[PDB]
Amino acid sequence: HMPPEQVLILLQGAEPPILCSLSRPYTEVTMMTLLTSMADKELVHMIAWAKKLPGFLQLSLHDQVLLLESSWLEVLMIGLIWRSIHCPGKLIFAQDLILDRNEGDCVEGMTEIFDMLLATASRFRLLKLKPEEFLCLKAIILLNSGAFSFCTGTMEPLHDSTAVQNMLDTITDALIHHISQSGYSAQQQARRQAQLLLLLSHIRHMSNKGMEHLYSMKCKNKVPLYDLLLEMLDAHHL
Amino acid sequence: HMPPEQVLILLQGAEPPILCSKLSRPYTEVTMMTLLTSMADKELVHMIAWAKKLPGFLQLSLHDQVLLLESSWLEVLMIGLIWRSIHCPGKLIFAQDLILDRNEGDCVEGMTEIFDMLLATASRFRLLKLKPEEFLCLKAIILLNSGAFSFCTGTMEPLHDSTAVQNMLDTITDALIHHISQSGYSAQQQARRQAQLLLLLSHIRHMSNKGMEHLYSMKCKNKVPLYDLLLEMLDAHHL
Incomplete structure (x- = not known):
């Protein structure tokens, strides 16, 4: 394996650039525009970030796509949580x-x-x-x-x-x-x-429960974020 | 903390007994579901009793007992099923x-x-x-x-x-x-x-998630009642 002190340098050097998005207060439709636009923006940065990891590009397209499709919202969530570590x-x-x-x-x-x-x-x-x-x-x-x-x-x-x-x-x-x-x-x-590592499995759990709650919001009040996220996965062929 | 050597004996002593079902082969769509729900309900009964034997579970409120069981019931079912099948590929x-x-x-x-x-x-x-x-x-x-x-x-x-x-x-x-x-x-x-x-445990939780989402999909696609049967199983046990 690549030595650990170099792994951390590679990982820090592969972090996505800082993102940037919008009139307040937000309505139901403006918040949907907010969330679906940042999901798409951070996914594009996620696919680019993954290709920077060592060995990711020598995998088959199928395995590259499977890994990304399996963990996209889990990666989206840990980064969002990490950015909000200091603002209760x-x-x-x-x-x-x-x-x-x-x-x-x-x-x-x-x-x-x-x-x-x-x-x-x-x-x-x-x-x-x-x-x-x-x-x-x-x-x-x-x-x-x-x-x-x-x-x-x-x-x-x-x-x-x-x-x-x-x-x-x-x-x-x-x-x-x-x-x-x-x-x-x-x-x-x-x-x-x-x-x-138990913190990791909770982030996975939050991903399931969140997407599942988004689906119930679709069935109950026609909240379309669940559909926008799924339709986003298609435009990026995941 | 209870010493680890004492923890392992308690956990071994608290294991549910060996479980048995006697329907005839081959199974059809209807018999497979009588099969799976009968074992799921039987497994859930034994898990609830198993949870009550761990030190500290009964001092929790009913709310926390119900929430803990309701969050993990299939993960506990799956890990036991996988563990029993460890030597029969x-x-x-x-x-x-x-x-x-x-x-x-x-x-x-x-x-x-x-x-x-x-x-x-x-x-x-x-x-x-x-x-x-x-x-x-x-x-x-x-x-x-x-x-x-x-x-x-x-x-x-x-x-x-x-x-x-x-x-x-x-x-x-x-x-x-x-x-x-x-x-x-x-x-x-x-x-x-x-x-x-601990990553294996994470996959088991992911496995529980994907399993039920697929069951719900089988309800929407082909009306396979297992999703509703399991959920009705969960009501009868208040969780």
């Missing part, structure tokens, strides 16, 4: 778009999604999540050797799970190395590593 | 007397994809040589989710006592760490093994 009650969707929690009230069902995200941002702050740990955790979210799809009536895994696993072990080795260098005891190193 | 041990071959899922459209998704993770169990002690820890960690919540009432509702569940969670993760340290691994292999297992 606020969510920084972009550098010109930081929304107070109550601003989601114009869309029925959106405020509880914000609360979900805001609660994990507070957990980020309580854990004192370091910038190195955020970079590793976000890359681990993408490099899921267990990724698969049902979209064709047959369970379709990766063409090369072992290659994705090789990249996964590289990142996880780098995470363990950084924690070993952050002045923790042997016991606290193992515990923190456990907390951070 | 191509087969899923639903019960002692209920061992389904992979192609027995062809009887219900969409079910074979779930079987393959389950069959793949069981192969990784075998690849990682998952130990009994690790399965017991991971299963309890699946239940003791200090970050569980619900959107049922139009508002984000977390646990009443996130700290208490976290104290229970940290007890199990410490025991898992302690068991890995006793399994003859080097310090480097210990930290790696720890990461492989």
Whole structure:
């Protein structure tokens, strides 16, 4: 594996450029325009960010697309949470778009999604999540050797799970190395590593529950964000 | 914290008994669902009783007990099913007397994809040589989710006592760490093994998510009632 101190330099050097989006107060339709436009903007930066990771481009297009399609909103969420680590009650969707929690009230069902995200941002702050740990955790979210799809009536895994696993072990080795260098005891190193990886599975859980809540908002009040996100996945052929 | 060696004996002592179903083969779309719901309800009954045997579960409020069980019920079902099938490639041990071959899922459209998704993770169990002690820890960690919540009432509702569940969670993760340290691994292999297992737990949660979303899709596409049957199963147990 590539040495861990260099992995962290590569990851930091591959971070997407700062984003930028809009008249307040937001209505139901302006907030939809807000959220669907930043999702598209950060996806385009996500696809470019992934191609910068070592070994990602030597994968088949199929495996590249499967990895991105599996983790896109999970990557979207961890970055949004990480940008809001230091503004309790606020969510920084972009550098010109930081929304107070109550601003989601114009869309029925959106405020509880914000609360979900805001609660994990507070957990980020309580854990004192370091910038190195955020970079590793976000890359681990993408490099899921267990990724698969049902979209064709047959369970379709990766063409090369072992290659994705090789990249996964590289990142996880780098995470363990950084924690070993952050002045923790042997016991606290193992515990923190456990907390951070359990933090990862919660972000995955928030992705399911959020998209599932967006679908119920579609059925209940015709909120179209669920459809806009799915239609966005098609325009990028995911 | 209860010492880890005591944690593993409690977890072993709290394991549900071996389960059995006796319908005749071959199964059709109707019999497969009587089969799957009968075991799911039986498994859920034994999980609820299993949850009550862990130290600290009963001191939680009913709200936190119900939320913990409601958030993890299928993840707990799936990890146990995969764990029982760790030594029979191509087969899923639903019960002692209920061992389904992979192609027995062809009887219900969409079910074979779930079987393959389950069959793949069981192969990784075998690849990682998952130990009994690790399965017991991971299963309890699946239940003791200090970050569980619900959107049922139009508002984000977390646990009443996130700290208490976290104290229970940290007890199990410490025991898992302690068991890995006793399994003859080097310090480097210990930290790696720890990461492989907790990521395995993440895949199981993803597996629970994808499984139910596919079941709902099978309801919308071909009216396969399993999604509604399971959900009605969850009402009868108040969660």
